[PDB]
Amino acid sequence: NQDKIIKFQFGKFARALISRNFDLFDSVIADKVNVMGQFESKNDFISTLSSASSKADADELEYLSVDDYYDLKSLKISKSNDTSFAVNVNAKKNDVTKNFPFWKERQTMIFTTEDDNNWFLSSIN
Amino acid sequence: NQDKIIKFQFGKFARALISRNFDLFDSVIADKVNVMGQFESKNDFISTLSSASSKADADELEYLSVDDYYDLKSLKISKSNDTSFAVNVNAKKNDVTKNFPFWKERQTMIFTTEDDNNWFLSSIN
């Protein structure tokens, strides 16, 4: 049933992106996140995201859909072990996404718990 | 050129809705807002919105598009006077919107400035 928590956490990641409100990333991202093989602080990862969003220089009403970032039909959630879920989804290239160095068509996100209460994004690739 | 501020402010209203993060409504809504002929406090209007969103009991990945709330092709912005803009848009009925008493197909929003710096939503109908 933790599947619903992961979907909620992925949903919150997605909602933060589409709304360009990065304060919503603060309860989703682990204290250290593996970004393409390199650990980053939560705050340095979140600031990478806000800074790239600003480079897109998008029209205020552009990219206000989850369908602009992801193919939600492709979304897959799989328990990896007691404390780890793998989330896979096919992601889209847009004026915002091209500015994310870590952004790939075929995405892998690991959500991990260190307390069995909270599931945080601890790896993206 | 205040047209771009109104579009930004409407965009922020839209982003708060789609992301279901009502904290984003706090810099958009005037201290008193005329909701269908009756003045409401900002906090009572925002809490109406959060409470209705919770009644929809929507799937976490449902209604993550501006196209689920509004027809953005219909959006119109018009200066009414020195301190007032009328924003008109055709709005959609969904499991979330049916729980908003003030929600209408044909929407009128007034953005007003009391300082010439900040344009706030002061009426919705």
Distance of alpha carbon A94 from alpha carbon B112, whole angstroms? 34
With residue B12 as reference, give the H or E element that holds it: helix B2-19
From chain A residues 37-66, the ones with a CB under 8 A of any chain B CB are 60-61, 64-66
What domains can you pick out in chain B, each with its CATH number? 2-124 (3.10.450.50)
Chain A residues closer than 8 Å to B18 by CB: 15, 18-19, 64
Put the strands of the sheet holding B38-41 in their side by side order.
B38-41, B29-35, B119-124, B106-113, B84-91, B70-81
Strand runs labelled E in A1-125: 29-35, 38-41, 70-81, 84-91, 106-112, 120-124
A68 touches A93 (CB < 8 A) = no
Chain B residues closer than 8 Å to A53 by CB: none
Candidates A11, A23, A61; nearest CB to B60: A11
Distance of alpha carbon A110 from alpha carbon A32, whole angstroms? 12
- Collapse the DSSP code of A2 into the 3-class scheme (helix H, G, I; strand E, B; otherwise coil) and give the result: helix
Distance of alpha carbon A115 from alpha carbon A117, whole angstroms? 5
The packing angle between helices A2-19 and B2-19, to 10°, is 180
B70-81 vs A29-35, strand pairing mode? unpaired
Distance of alpha carbon B53 from alpha carbon B51, whole angstroms? 5
Can you read off the two tokens belonging to residue B106?
Answer: 């044909």
B84-91 vs A106-112, strand pairing mode? unpaired
10 Å Cβ neighbour count for A10? 24
B71 touches chain A (CB under 8 A): no
Alpha helices in B30-85 (DSSP H): 42-56
